[PDB]
Design a protein around this nucleic acid. Sequence first.
RNA 1: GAAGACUAACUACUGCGAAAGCAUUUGCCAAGGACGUUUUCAUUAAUCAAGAACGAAAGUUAGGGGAUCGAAGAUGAUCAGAUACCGUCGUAGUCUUAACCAUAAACUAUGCCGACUAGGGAUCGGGUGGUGUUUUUUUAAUGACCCACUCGGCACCUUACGAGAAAU
RNA 2: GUCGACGUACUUCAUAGGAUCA
Lengths: 127, 181, 81, 108, 214
Amino acid sequence: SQVFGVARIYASFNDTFVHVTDLSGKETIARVTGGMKVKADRDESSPYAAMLAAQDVAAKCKEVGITAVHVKIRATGGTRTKTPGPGGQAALRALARSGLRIGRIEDVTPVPSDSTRKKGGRRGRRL
Amino acid sequence: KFESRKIMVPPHRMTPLRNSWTKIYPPLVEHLKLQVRMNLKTKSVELRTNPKFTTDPGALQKGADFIKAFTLGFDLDDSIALLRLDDLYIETFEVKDVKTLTGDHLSRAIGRIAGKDGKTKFAIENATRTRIVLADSKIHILGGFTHIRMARESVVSLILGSPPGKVYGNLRTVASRLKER
Amino acid sequence: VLVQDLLHPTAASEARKHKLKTLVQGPRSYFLDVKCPGCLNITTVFSHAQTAVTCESCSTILCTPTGGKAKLSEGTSFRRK
Amino acid sequence: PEEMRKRTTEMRLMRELMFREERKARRLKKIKSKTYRKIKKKELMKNRELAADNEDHDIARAKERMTLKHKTNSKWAKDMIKHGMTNDAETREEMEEMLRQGERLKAK
Amino acid sequence: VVDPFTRKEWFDIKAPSTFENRNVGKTLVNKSTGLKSASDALKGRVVEVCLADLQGSEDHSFRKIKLRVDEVQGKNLLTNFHGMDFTTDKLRSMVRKWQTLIEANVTVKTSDDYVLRIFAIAFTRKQANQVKRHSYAQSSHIRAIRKVISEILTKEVQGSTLAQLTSKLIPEVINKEIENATKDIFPLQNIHVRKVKLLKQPKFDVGALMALHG
RNA sequence: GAAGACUAACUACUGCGAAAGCAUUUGCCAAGGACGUUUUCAUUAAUCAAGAACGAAAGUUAGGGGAUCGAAGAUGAUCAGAUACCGUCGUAGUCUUAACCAUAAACUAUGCCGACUAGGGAUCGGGUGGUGUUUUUUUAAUGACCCACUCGGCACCUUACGAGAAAU
RNA sequence: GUCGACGUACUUCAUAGGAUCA
Ligand SMILES: [Mg+2]
Ligand SMILES: [Mg+2]
Ligand SMILES: [Mg+2]
Ligand SMILES: [Mg+2]
Ligand SMILES: [Mg+2]
Ligand SMILES: [Mg+2]
Ligand SMILES: [Mg+2]
Ligand SMILES: [Mg+2]
């Protein structure tokens, strides 16, 4: 009946990658970033850029055979933030509003059983 | 086109869910054409779009965003604002994700973010048109993308050490250059 | 009641205080007398034992040590001395 | 019965009320920082006055004249004055506060 | 200059015997050229299926399964069992304040000699007239529970091959055995096994694999 | 797959240690406080110039290791404002064995031992009591809770009869 | 050498508070 693929949404400060692969993970069918869809560098990570990214991927994969996706959304993780920002959820919203069928949303950020140092020093990084 | 979500409920927000349920299932059912069901035998809300009634494909994720924003700690009306508009996102971060603090230092950091009688928190919300809930250490911000980057930059300038008077002053400057645009 | 006699405290009061803090201090254990079923003869056993007291003739066990009062083995009869 | 389960949920909610209040009071007990305690005392005296007989005043004046406790022959004040330490205006704030409190008592 | 989805050919992943919905889904390879035949490019993939979508259930909405492709025949490719896991959101929602967390693992070799390492989690609970609010254990209980859990996992793995262990993991029998054998020590809600992962697959033995989908 | 650090959530400034400090499992080694005691010795004690053991982080000597972060250094930008003064590579270090060094807001800005002085609710450890609840084996018995008590800890509330100029 | 670290000697900066009246 249906054909399923996975949509991996990396949602960093400074981009959002919408990847769509198979179940297996290896073969990829559609990568777009957010950076391909706005040529201003202000706002590679802006929600609007993410929306355009996701619409392009949904179109391209609908032109293959693939009608439903499970989504795996992740922030940077590691020793940085661990929760998807706005770029990932804008991509998710604009992916559900696309005629794809979505099942089984989850969230796989890498989370350490405590790990190495964090960039920045004794006084914290960003302000 | 029959489709679902299911989102879990942590226990400190399970009393206010079964305490404000009466205002939640209506603007999920008629206005959205969406079929709620709350499981208790796994403590979780479940939603399903039924193929007959529904029109907007974004209804299912609209409702899931609404309930989840109620889950993270935001009051009912604010989550309703997440249900209505199309420009509302949440950004969550920590206190150990800016500067590694622990011991008493961390409880004093939350004291500077929250201010006495909530004042400092409210100032950041009122001059940025966002809504902040400040959990154990994790801090959650609701608004539109540019506004939450303004409020994130003030909160992070408060974690790292800057006093609160400086952030009122810089906040009202931000309010000036926000309200004109 | 700020005159209840320190020289005559009611036995409930002296019964709940620590053993070193009653008016004239004294022990709170007792010696209890024990018969194992198999023999007839009896032996005296401290209530708070620290040695597993083998019966004398039918030499098995009568009590096991605990952190406090001894745990009497269930196949036993006893009478407080 | 089942009314026991009602009793247990009542004692549960009392215990967690007790624990939240005790956690708050611990964290506040550690903050000694004389501006923070000074602010809390100021707005307390304001709320005390808003929200919430001569004989008590005459006993208080009598004890104050018997004792003369609020003049600069006291150990703290004579220490501060005699070692030029009250020219800094904060400890002069404190010393004047002592003196006016004593002057409130001696008024008739 | 390519448009790569002109040449890739779909295949379909079939679950093993010990599951209800044996069909799983499709996957892409490349066309089977001479000089890089396709079949030698399928034979190591692992696939993640959430076993609700593999057993029709819905209280199995956590517990992803990893299935590994090992054989291929005529646009069917037959799989195996690679490991099992929880979804990270259930696991984040069990772990709460004012209670203690007991965890245990073990390394164990099965009947068919698959060496595998298997995890286990458990949490204490407030017995239903407890008033005091936390109920931690006393850490000389926790070593008793850890030893009990480890003895039961060791015993109950290696009296089974792999298929039997798999179908002792689906109806969650190990949970009930842990629960019964560990309630004179301490109350202990929420027992699970939360992970199992292979470390040494022995040697191929086509007979077992084609005995599953036989 | 390799490597070297680190032990998140649970996690409570509650627990332990003379302090510095200590958070994955399992075993081995030796040690420790409190409790219980109708055991034992019988003043063996308290505080201590000299003298001695230990003493975070940084730092030196000689080997090992060198993943991450990174004093110095080198470079990119120096775009009104920097409000939003940083990017990139990184030697020493960070880790460890054997010797050095002997300092911290080493904090309770508070010497140690002994006595007395008030009311309460909680929590950690030990003990005593209970025809209380569950864990039933089939009724026990432990274990887990509940209630009362008691010794010994870390803290909290309310009042002083008291103390202070006041915070307390 | 209008040199540094000390050791002596000295100088200087921080004083008004309440009440009534205008
Ligand atoms: Mg000396
Ligand atoms: Mg050192
Ligand atoms: Mg070093
Ligand atoms: Mg070296
Ligand atoms: Mg670097
Ligand atoms: Mg030394
Ligand atoms: Mg310290
Ligand atoms: Mg010193």
